[PDB]
Amino acid sequence: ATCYCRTGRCATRESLSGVCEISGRLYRLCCR
């Protein structure tokens, strides 16, 4: 799969691995 941070929820196929941190803002890490 491909883990990456995004500004919000990801797709169903993706998988949350943890909470990212970008620009001081918390991001969501999803893996697909």
Curated annotation (Swiss-Prot):
Changing S15A: Increased interaction with B.antracis lef/lethal factor. Changing G24R: Enhanced antibacterial activity against both E.coli and S.aureus. Changing R32K: Does not impair antimicrobial activity against E.coli, E.aerogenes, S.aureus and B.cereus. Reduced induction of IL-8 secretion. Changing R28A: Does not disrupt homodimer-formation. Reduced enhancement of S.flexneri infection. Impairs antimicrobial activity against E.coli, E.aerogenes, S.aureus and B.cereus. Reduced induction of IL-8 secretion. Changing C10S: Prohibits tetramer formation. Changing R9A: Reduced killing of S.aureus and E.coli. Impairs antimicrobial activity against E.coli, E.aerogenes, S.aureus and B.cereus. Reduced induction of IL-8 secretion. Disulfide bonds join C3-C31, C5-C20, C10-C30. This is HD5(63-94). It comes from Homo sapiens. The gene is DEFA5. The chain holds residues 63 to 94 of 94 of the full protein.
